[PDB]
């Protein structure tokens, strides 16, 4: 019953990014800080200090009024509070296996996280604090935050205030590849980043990919998304407002509506252009192109079919304006973050960032990105009695005589007056 | 700290391009051109039973035991990532689901000089994770099927589908879901470089020993020798505070190598020479630093105060704490190449709010959005405020004009 009442009237890289990064990294590897400063001057026209001091942080944010600060403080605490809860959800343990064998999981934060904040125009303050706040909540002891200098004065003061309030340990006025590489190689700080996070342009993305591989492109990149699942009980005016909400980001921001209600679909399709029409010019232009080219509406038969299509689309941000929200929570399986019910909405902000599904399911920005699970094992002598035998035999069946001797040596040492079937030794 | 001792992928684009277009046909085509395979790819309960009747009860009991040492750990590790609900700001509920992925592909090289553990580690781990479908591939052996040891392991580990199939054909089959109609959400298993770039496009061995003066240099030597015999590119490191032990070990390794059988003797000679390393350190604190920088896939710890090392070491694949256990007894997991239950599990986060909560959250959002010049965002807050609090007048920020 899947019917595209409105369809994607467009489709979603370059080697250009690769060239620059490779050349730029090669150079920064060679020259270090001097190359970084040079790129800063050539690219950003910047000649100031790189590492901010407590005083310059305090000075450059002194015109941010108490009311703006209080709001950012509030938004940041939300992220922190979810992040602390999420950290407690990954436990350490030990377990007895074969008698005399103990095995376990240690859980520890990485030492150093680098956070980049694009601090351009059409970017949320949230981008500055989400990485930093999450890393600190994870228990990462050192967080380096970078953002390109805004208009010659330094870091955009909101971004800078957000860095400080979120708990960044070191702040640096650097943009682009040279920021990513400095954080990665530990320039200016002497603490190489175990991971680097944060959105940016193709160059920042490519820099992360090159330096970190899979843990550098596993967080949601590209333009802002929004998906809404809605049945007959949903309110079309709200639904349409929520799509238009993320569509003002730019001309490539996808806004999807999956619904089991033709009536809703029709009303939303009608309401959206009216709402766009009443935006201020910048947003009006952004949203028109955004909805025109990338807006989709999918009428489905049953709930199950909505689950299928939503899981396929795997929206970074997914609202559920339906009855029986418990069902939808229990059945949906691929999305970035879920907004259950009408009350919450995407613009209230994420608690985590979802994976880069446009490449698939794995990664994202949460405390889990900043934590290592290490496994260990330990045995009594007694336990080896059984395990040594098995390993010797299996080893000699694999043709691994050296492996077997590791068991033989232990069997000999731990059980001197004992006979054991340790397999037939390898003669080839 | 002082160093004593020191040290195509284009057929993938085409083969995939051909499998994408032609599907199952291309896989059976590629099967005879690279392996000469005639029969169907998908085995059946009978073929699996027939082909594993040659394996004795004592061998099976060994493999079964070894799988239980993996499975039982994996089961515990699965429960270590919890689902939860939490209240933040009053009336804000938020939480985390933990879901197995749907289908995992496992690939085992049926070759010799490989561990049987290769075949069961992925399969068993995926099953303990709660994954409902595990597809398992392994390259045939001279038109005679999969090595019965690999096949028995697959089955005993709890594979749902077993497919005799190799290389890029295997990976792509599993990844597109040819023969089963079930695309794997992830594929795992060692293989050749074709296998590797096949994994890269769609989606050596090691050992280290930390030891102090209380270590038994014979055992330390033997353990280094144990994994050396894999190949000429298997590193075998020693980090120690004891020059004495450092020497006796460097002395006794060659004597153990020399006493090995033919293939293993020369395998270890190259490796221990080319890649073997030794590092003497003044303090424990120093050894931690160096171990962490190397991050061995397998790391043994033969010292006093094993707790301290458990507490302070922070980078490795698998830790073997104390003398008694040893690399050869097997991993519970694989470090980064890592393989664990966590690899096969999604977290999904969600939030829900009362109307009361949006009183404060909505007006903060409207003010921030409008500083960011995001008028439409702010209007999602406005609309909620008008619907839930009809006569309210909160500071929702100055509307954007630009
Ligand atoms: N709408 C969303 O969902 C958001 C996404 N993002 C993304 O962040 C992006 C921001 O990009 P920008 O404004 O450029 O900020 P940015 O901070 O990511 O990049 C600026 C830096 O890029 C460097 N750079 C620019 N062109 C270069 C070139 N040709 N070679 C080398 N270095 C170069 C500059 O020197 C500067 O240091 C947006 O395009 C957006 O896609 C960020 C915020 C929100
Ligand atoms: N210590 C480690 O890191 C371990 C990794 N390994 C690796 O497993 C591999 C074992 O190699 P094999 O036993 O041969 O198994 P393999 O993984 O190389 O698979 C063999 C299959 O490759 C395919 N193939 C052969 N020639 C091809 C070609 N020209 N183009 C495309 N596909 C082709 C065929 O289907 C054949 O059945 C080695 O690379 C070894 O290093 C072994 C297990 C442990
Ligand atoms: Zn937004
Ligand atoms: Zn081995």
Author numbering:
A (entry chain A): 1 to 12, 15 to 361, 368 to 436
B (entry chain B): 2 to 8, 19 to 214, 225 to 358, 372 to 436
In the authors' words:
Here, we study DHPS-3-dehydrogenase from Cupriavidus pinatubonensis (CpHpsN), a bacterium capable of utilizing DHPS as a sole carbon source. Kinetic analysis of CpHpsN reveals a strict preference for R-DHPS, catalyzing its 4-electron oxidation to R-SL, with high specificity for NAD+ over NADP+. CpHpsN forms a domain-swapped tight dimer with 28% of surface area buried at the dimer interface, with the interface featuring extensive hydrophobic and hydrogen-bond interactions. Domain 4 lies at the C-terminus and contributes to the active site and is also involved in dimerization through a metal binding site. Coordination of Zn2+ involves three residues from one monomer and one residue (His411*; * denotes the other monomer in the dimer) from the other monomer, showing that the enzyme forms an obligate dimer.
Crystals of the CpHpsN·Zn2+·NADH complex were obtained by soaking CpHpsN·Zn2+ crystals with NADH and diffracted to 2.24 Å. Attempts to soak the CpHpsN·Zn2+ crystals with high concentrations of NADH/NAD+, and SL or DHPS were unsuccessful to obtain a substrate or product bound complex. CpHpsN structures in both space groups contain a dimer in the asymmetric unit. No activity was detected for the D352A mutant of CpHpsN, most likely due to the inability to form a productive zinc-coordination complex with substrate. The 3D structure of the CpHpsN D352A mutant in complex with Zn2+ and NAD+ was solved and refined to 2.23 Å resolution and is essentially identical to the CpHpsN·Zn2+·NADH structure in the ‘open’ conformation.
